[PDB]
Design a protein around this ligand. Structure first.
Ligand SMILES: COc1ccc2c(c1)[nH]c1c(C)nccc12
Length: 343
């Protein structure tokens, strides 16, 4: 069996060969990423004299269409004045090559998960976390401009990359799962650890689900561990409940999947159901962040910029992002005015 004249493997992926050169322009270096969409390779652009990252989409109509949506949104974004657009990875161009759709992006550095692995999952300082947070909020602000109304849908450490391994500037990548504010066709979305309550509950969702994700990410950048690391949806909701309590009644009364996690008592109130979890609301974020005990594992005592005052402003911003009600969950514009960023 031969695939795409020998260029593809059985998984519809282009067989990457180091040193090969395409269209007498790009010189392939090495594979730097895999995913259900296909692969990501580091290449050198002879014409522009620069390094670029090329995303080679699998040779399958299903994935090809997924990518065309990504191209559309990217082109739509990169057609907007503001410098806010500079927190979104830039698509230089795209072309079909040997039946594969290729997207050429500016070359970037490590993703934040890699960064967390180098701290051996102990986290980065509160000051570095603040820099990331401010950029992330500005990116979400940009995705929220009316004409765009883009929901990334897959924010997580792996999709936030540093521009330069020395500087702290970051960029959001991978809009393959993104959509514009529209109609809840799909329901099983976002990576589990960062899945918002409304998605878990099967309710309508909008741009707010990205802010919930951000909150989970910030806490994880600082503590070094996922705030809610469920092994499945039920375990995921229970871990969320340990920290924020039972969701408000008005929300559960409309949750199509509420009875998958809770039970409505004969009196109208809700409680966790059957089946290792501290009581609702007993696992305070105050303690998780170590506000009064020198940060996570007390490993931040004496470190400049880690006073109780600082930690409080951080605990506050996070709680405003992890609000159960998507209607009152803090939006990008105001998060940026929060006293946590106040100089
Ligand atoms: C290592 O540098 C990059 C630059 C752009 C992207 C990248 C890695 N990974 C991407 C993915 C998974 N999607 C769109 C753009 C990129």
């Amino acid at each position: 069996k031969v695939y795409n004249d020998g260029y593809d493997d059985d998984n519809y992926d282009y067989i990457v060969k180091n040193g090969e050169k395409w269209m007498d322009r790009y010189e392939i270096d090495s594979l730097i990423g895999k995913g259900s969409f296909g692969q990501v390779v580091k290449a050198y652009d002879r014409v522009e004299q620069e390094w670029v990252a090329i995303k080679i989409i699998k040779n399958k109509k299903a994935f090809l269409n997924q990518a065309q949506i990504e191209v559309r949104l990217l082109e739509l974004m990169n057609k907007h004045d503001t410098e806010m657009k500079y927190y979104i990875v830039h698509l230089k161009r795209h072309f079909m090559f040997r039946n594969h759709l290729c997207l050429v992006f500016e070359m970037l550095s490590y993703n934040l998960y890699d960064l967390l692995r180098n701290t051996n999952f102990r986290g980065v300082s509160l000051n570095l976390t603040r820099k990331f947070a401010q950029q992330m909020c500005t990116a979400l602000l940009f995705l929220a401009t009316p004409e765009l109304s883009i929901i990334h849908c897959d924010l997580k450490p792996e999709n936030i990359l540093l521009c330069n391994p020395k500087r702290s500037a970051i960029k959001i990548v991978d809009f393959g799962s993104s959509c514009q504010l529209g109609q809840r066709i799909y329901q099983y979305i976002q990576s589990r650890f960062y899945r918002s309550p409304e998605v878990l509950l099967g309710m309508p969702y909008d741009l707010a689900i990205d802010m919930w994700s951000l909150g989970c990410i910030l806490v994880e950048m600082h503590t070094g561990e996922p705030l809610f690391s469920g092994a499945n949806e039920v375990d995921q909701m229970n871990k969320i409940v340990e920290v924020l309590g039972i969701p408000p009644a008005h929300i559960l009364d409309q949750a199509p999947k509420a009875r998958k996690f809770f039970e409505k008592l004969p009196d109208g109130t809700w409680n966790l159901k059957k089946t290792e979890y501290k009581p609702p609301g007993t696992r305070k974020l105050h303690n998780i962040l170590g506000v009064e005990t020198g940060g996570p594992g007390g490993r931040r005592a004496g470190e400049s910029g880690h006073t109780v005052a600082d930690y409080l402003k951080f605990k506050d911003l996070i709680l405003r992002m992890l609000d159960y009600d998507p209607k009152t969950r803090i939006q990008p514009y105001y998060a940026l005015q929060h006293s946590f960023f106040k100089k």
